[PDB]
Amino acid sequence: THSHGLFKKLGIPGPTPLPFLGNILSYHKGFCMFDMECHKKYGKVWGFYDGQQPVLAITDPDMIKTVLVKECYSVFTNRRPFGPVGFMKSAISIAEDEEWKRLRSLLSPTFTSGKLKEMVPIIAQYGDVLVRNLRREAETGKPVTLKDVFGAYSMDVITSTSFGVNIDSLNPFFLSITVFPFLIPILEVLNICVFPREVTNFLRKSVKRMKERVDFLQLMIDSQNSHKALSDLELVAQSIIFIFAGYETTSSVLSFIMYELATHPDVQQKLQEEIDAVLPNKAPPTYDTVLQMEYLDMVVNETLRLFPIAMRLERVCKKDVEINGMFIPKGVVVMIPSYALHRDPKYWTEPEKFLPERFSKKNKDNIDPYIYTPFGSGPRNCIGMRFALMNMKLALIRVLQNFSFKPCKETQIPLKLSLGGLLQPEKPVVLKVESR
Amino acid sequence: THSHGLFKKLGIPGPTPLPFLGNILSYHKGFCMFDMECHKKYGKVWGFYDGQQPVLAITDPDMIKTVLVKECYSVFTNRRPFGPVGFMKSAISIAEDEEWKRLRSLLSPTFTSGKLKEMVPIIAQYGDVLVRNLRREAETGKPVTLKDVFGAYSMDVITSTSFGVNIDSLNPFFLSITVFPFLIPILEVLNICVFPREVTNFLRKSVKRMKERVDFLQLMIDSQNSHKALSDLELVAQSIIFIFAGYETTSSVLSFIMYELATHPDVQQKLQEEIDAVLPNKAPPTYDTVLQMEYLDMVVNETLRLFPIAMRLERVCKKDVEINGMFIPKGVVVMIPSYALHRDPKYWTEPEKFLPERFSKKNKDNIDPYIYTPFGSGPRNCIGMRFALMNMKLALIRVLQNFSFKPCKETQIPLKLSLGGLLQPEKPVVLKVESR
Numbered sequence: 088t089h090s091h092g093l094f095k096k097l098g099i100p101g102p103t104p105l106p107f108l109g110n111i112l113s114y115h116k117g118f119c120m121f122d123m124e125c126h127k128k129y130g131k132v133w134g135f136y137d138g139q140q141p142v143l144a145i146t147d148p149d150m151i152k153t154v155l156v157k158e159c160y161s162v163f164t165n166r167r168p169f170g171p172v173g174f175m176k177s178a179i180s181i182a183e184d185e186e187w188k189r190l191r192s193l194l195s196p197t198f199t200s201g202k203l204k205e206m207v208p209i210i211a212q213y214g215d216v217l218v219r220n221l222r223r224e225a226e227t228g229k230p231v232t233l234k235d236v237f238g239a240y241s242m243d244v245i246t247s248t249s250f251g252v253n254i255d256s257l258n259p260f261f262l263s264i265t266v267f268p269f270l271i272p273i274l275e276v277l278n279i280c281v282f283p284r285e286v287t288n289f290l291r292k293s294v295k296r297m298k299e300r301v302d303f304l305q306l307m308i309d310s311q312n313s314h315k316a317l318s319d320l321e322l323v324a325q326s327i328i329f330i331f332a333g334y335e336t337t338s339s340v341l342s343f344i345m346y347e348l349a350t351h352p353d354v355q356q357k358l359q360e361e362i363d364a365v366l367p368n369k370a371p372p373t374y375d376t377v378l379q380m381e382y383l384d385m386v387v388n389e390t391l392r393l394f395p396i397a398m399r400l401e402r403v404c405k406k407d408v409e410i411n412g413m414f415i416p417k418g419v420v421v422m423i424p425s426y427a428l429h430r431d432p433k434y435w436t437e438p439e440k441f442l443p444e445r446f447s448k449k450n451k452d453n454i455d456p457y458i459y460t461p462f463g464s465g466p467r468n469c470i471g472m473r474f475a476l477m478n479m480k481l482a483l484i485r486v487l488q489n490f491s492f493k494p495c496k497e498t499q500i501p502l503k504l505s506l507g508g509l510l511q512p513e514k515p516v517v518l519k520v521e522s523r
Numbered sequence: 524t525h526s527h528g529l530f531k532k533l534g535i536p537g538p539t540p541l542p543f544l545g546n547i548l549s550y551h552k553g554f555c556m557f558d559m560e561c562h563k564k565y566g567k568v569w570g571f572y573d574g575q576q577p578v579l580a581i582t583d584p585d586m587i588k589t590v591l592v593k594e595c596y597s598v599f600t601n602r603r604p605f606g607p608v609g610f611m612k613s614a615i616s617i618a619e620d621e622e623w624k625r626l627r628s629l630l631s632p633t634f635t636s637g638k639l640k641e642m643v644p645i646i647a648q649y650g651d652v653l654v655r656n657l658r659r660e661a662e663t664g665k666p667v668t669l670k671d672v673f674g675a676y677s678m679d680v681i682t683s684t685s686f687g688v689n690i691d692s693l694n695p696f697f698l699s700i701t702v703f704p705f706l707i708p709i710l711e712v713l714n715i716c717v718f719p720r721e722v723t724n725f726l727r728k729s730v731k732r733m734k735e736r737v738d739f740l741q742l743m744i745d746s747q748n749s750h751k752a753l754s755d756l757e758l759v760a761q762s763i764i765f766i767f768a769g770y771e772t773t774s775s776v777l778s779f780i781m782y783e784l785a786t787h788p789d790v791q792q793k794l795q796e797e798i799d800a801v802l803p804n805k806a807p808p809t810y811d812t813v814l815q816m817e818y819l820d821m822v823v824n825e826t827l828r829l830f831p832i833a834m835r836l837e838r839v840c841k842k843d844v845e846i847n848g849m850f851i852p853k854g855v856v857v858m859i860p861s862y863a864l865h866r867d868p869k870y871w872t873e874p875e876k877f878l879p880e881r882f883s884k885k886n887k888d889n890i891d892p893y894i895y896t897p898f899g900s901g902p903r904n905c906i907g908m909r910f911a912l913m914n915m916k917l918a919l920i921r922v923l924q925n926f927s928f929k930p931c932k933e934t935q936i937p938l939k940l941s942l943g944g945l946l947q948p949e950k951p952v953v954l955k956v957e958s959r
């Protein structure tokens with residue numbers, strides 16, 4: 088624990104680290120509470136230790152823009168390593184430096200405006216499965232688990248948009264990794280993975296069994312026809328990454344939104360009127376009608392403020408720099424506390440209140456893009472942003488065109504956040520559903 | 524690799540060990556071929572190294588009886604450790620010394636003659652599910668996968684006999700452990716288990732959800748009313764052990780038997796006649812009618828000779844001894860090569876031929892019980908022997924009372940054994956089924 092002297096030397100403040108553990112015992116309220124409390128206790132900049140790993144928090148918009156954008160390629164190219172990963176080191180969200188630049192370049196036209204447009208008339212089928220599955224679980228007095236039917240929809244979107252598989256989807260130790268990150272090399276030589284070898288072996292062969300537009304796999308197969316050419320396993324590993332995000336992020340966010348709509352009935356009505364004015368007669372939403380719904384966008388934007396599911400953004404400082412008058416020595420992890428900045432009263436009036444009008448064009452400009460960052464920023468931001476927003480908005484239009492949402496006896500009010508690792512709710516979201 | 528001098532010193536012969544790996548590269552033909560070849564090359568006694576771990580093979584019946592029986596409690600009490608195990612160190616097949624003696628004593632009356640008898644009229648229901656599931660997959664030209672419908676039956680026997688759950692069941696790195704057994708302590712502090720924490724968490728709570736004769740769980744719950752008293756988690760971990768054996772061993776053996784019957788049509792007819800003489804009119808088999816069928820027993824006995832699914836028996840020598848005129852120093856693993864002894868021509872004429880008459884009472888006596896040992900011997904033998912035999916025999920009577928079994932184009936003839944770890948076949952067993 089010789090490394091625990093770094094921040095005292097640099098004159099950067101923070102909580103005093105315990106030997107070996109660093110500051111990790113403070114994760115007992117979750118990343119988010121620790122960050123918020125640190126943000127209060129110390130200010131625009133502070134430091135702590137994940138084990139022996141020094142981590143510097145920054146909250147200055149300029150500094151954040153310097154890290155996330157200005158010096159991305161040169162200094163702050165990669166994220167904190169987190170093995171053992173195996174054959175998935177070749178996945179874009181994990182790869183680094185030159186190998187990452189290769190994959191970012193190769194996989195970016197997958198997510199264009201125009202390819203997303205080709206995906207709309209296809210994403211459109213499973214909202215109608217989603218509604219008919221909601222019909223059954225609503226025609227009778229029986230509260231619904233959103234993450235069940237949102238996940239089943241998110242999955243149906245994934246299998247389709249990623250492989251063409253059109254299915255009706257009714258058919259804990261990481262802590263030791265920070266105290267023992269020296270044990271990651273060890274688990275790598277033991278073939279131990281954070282997956283099982285079965286889910287991936289399922290797909291390693293499944294990919295070659297189809298077989299053989301517009302799913303991500305074809306899009307990537309087409310790109311194998313500046314840099315080199317995507318290889319076969321490299322493509323399987325990207326599939327797995329895409330499947331993670333589009334299933335768990337999409338449906339989890341969709342649950343925070345139905346919760347907010349159900350606990351704020353005015354905002355639900357105001358939005359149901361908009362959907363009916365743009366799409367009268369319950370007209371099927373399209374790419375452009377979706378981008379036309381402003382209140383819908385404000386709802387989505389404000390929900391991501393309260394529940395930024397990344398919570399933090401992170402870049403490893405790959406060599407001594409002096410960003411914005413501050414020396415940052417190589418190997419430090421630079422961290423942006425999204426959740427805490429999103430709930431910072433120095434930028435957001437009533438920051439725990441769910442107030443979509445913050446994102447009205449009347450007020451959307453008093454909002455610093457390096458304070459509100461649910462999808463990252465600069466060259467390593469969420470490659471899947473536009474798809475994610477489109478994917479979700481398509482769900483809400485078709486669901487709010489048919490149903491209204493009420494709190495139950497079991498509805499957790501107020502929603503506790505996962506005190507643990509990922510930004511989920513404690514009890515699952517359950518509401519009453521009713522048909523218009 | 525200072526430990527690799529042990530067998531040269533003791534003047535005990537064997538294959539020369541490579542540094543660090545020991546003799547493990549020889550597992551490329553599988554345990555069995557290495558043992559058979561060692562048995563030939565060197566004789567009644569030889570030695571090798573799993574990494575730095577010295578292992579002594581013995582094939583003398585007296586010596587085997589000394590290890591397995593005479594000096595079991597005193598010297599040869601436990602098996603080779605094989606973590607990481609977690610909360611399952613408390614499972615009988617894994618526990619050692621005093622803790623094992625406690626569990627062997629507490630769990631033995633579960634498997635009496637009389638408790639097995641109470642299980643017959645209950646095991647009897649799922650042979651009739653097995654037959655009706657075989658009916659559908661046979662009424663039309665379509666070969667059957669035995670391990671599918673034998674496993675589904677073995678499972679239905681398990682869930683019932685172990686928890687009362689009556690369900691119709693149509694509803695790779697270990698190598699590093701021997702070169703790196705020093706890494707087992709490491710994986711233990713990382714909570715890494717050979718299970719997932721989900722299968723067991725499934726059961727840790729499931730056990731307490733029922734709720735609350737004659738299943739194993741009740742039998743064990745009753746025994747919590749010389750030694751101490753079985754605890755709550757100790758009981759969950761025994762459930763998991765029982766479920767392993769009774770599912771995978773039972774159905775795998777049942778596949779070697781249907782294979783032998785289908786590839787030896789006389790023995791299939793001779794057995795079908797016996798079942799019909801003891802149980803005319805397809806009378807439902809009972810505990811006693813099953814113990815009456817001698818040819819059936821001979822079939823089972825001979826199949827376990829060709830496919831002893833343990834392959835080896837193993838005991839750790841817990842202190843210097845001199846069994847049968849031979850010094851054995853503490854820490855050596857003593858190993859009995861079942862598979863190789865079962866296929867040794869010095870005891871078995873035509874040992875690769877499937878000849879049940881070796882177990883006719885006319886000849887069953889020319890058979891040394893420390894050469895043929897499919898269930899172990901002495902105080903640590905298979906606690907589940909009588910249940911296993913009963914369980915399987917019940918399946919064959921009801922299945923051979925209705926169906927006959929023929930080889931297909933895809934039937935692997937001759938059966939290759941799993942060249943890898945466990946004693947399974949290479950391609951799965953598939954046969955034609957037909958209704959009498």
Ligand SMILES: CC(C)(C)OC(=O)N[C@@H](CS[C@@H](Cc1cccc2ccccc12)C(=O)NCc1cccnc1)Cc1cccc2ccccc12
Pocket residue numbers: 169172175178180181261281282328329331332336396397398469508
């Ligand atoms: C243990 C800890 C929480 C510290 O680490 C993670 O367990 N897993 C993060 C890193 S990778 C991935 C998800 C994933 C989970 C479990 C095992 C994996 C094994 C190999 C590769 C990826 C695996 C992923 O990126 N899926 C796309 C995504 C997810 C969320 C939002 N958008 C896109 C997950 C993570 C969370 C928040 C922001 C992230 C930004 C870039 C990369 C990962 C990010």
Ligand SMILES: CC(C)(C)OC(=O)N[C@@H](CS[C@@H](Cc1cccc2ccccc12)C(=O)NCc1cccnc1)Cc1cccc2ccccc12
Pocket residue numbers: 605608611614616617697717718764765767768772832833834905944
């Ligand atoms: C890797 C290697 C092949 C060397 O080790 C094993 O992977 N697993 C043997 C040891 S324990 C168990 C099966 C089991 C598998 C995987 C993970 C486990 C984790 C915790 C506890 C048990 C686990 C078991 O005993 N189930 C009852 C049984 C099985 C077979 C015949 N009768 C009874 C399996 C084994 C094989 C042959 C004979 C055995 C005798 C005593 C104990 C175990 C024996």
Ligand code: HEM
Pocket residue numbers: 179180181191328329332333336337340395396397400401460461462463464465466467468469470471472474475
């Ligand atoms: C509500 C949904 C989502 C949210 C809120 C979200 C947010 C984020 C954030 C904050 C990051 C890190 C940005 C940074 O480090 O600067 C990220 C990265 C990433 N996301 Fe998303 N994401 C979502 C959905 C998706 C989807 C649907 C995909 C589909 C492919 C996806 C693919 C990725 C990838 C590939 C990366 C890493 C980019 C790179 O390393 O080059 N995400 N996401």
Ligand code: HEM
Pocket residue numbers: 615616617627764765768769772773776831832833836837896897898899900901902903904905906907908910911
């Ligand atoms: C065809 C089926 C089976 C065969 C061939 C078989 C064989 C064996 C063998 C060879 C051993 C090691 C014996 C020794 O070390 O001396 C063993 C141990 C064991 N078996 Fe079985 N077995 C079978 C089924 C079962 C079943 C159904 C159970 C159900 C509970 C079971 C429970 C156990 C236990 C608990 C042990 C360890 C005994 C102890 O350590 O005290 N086995 N088996």
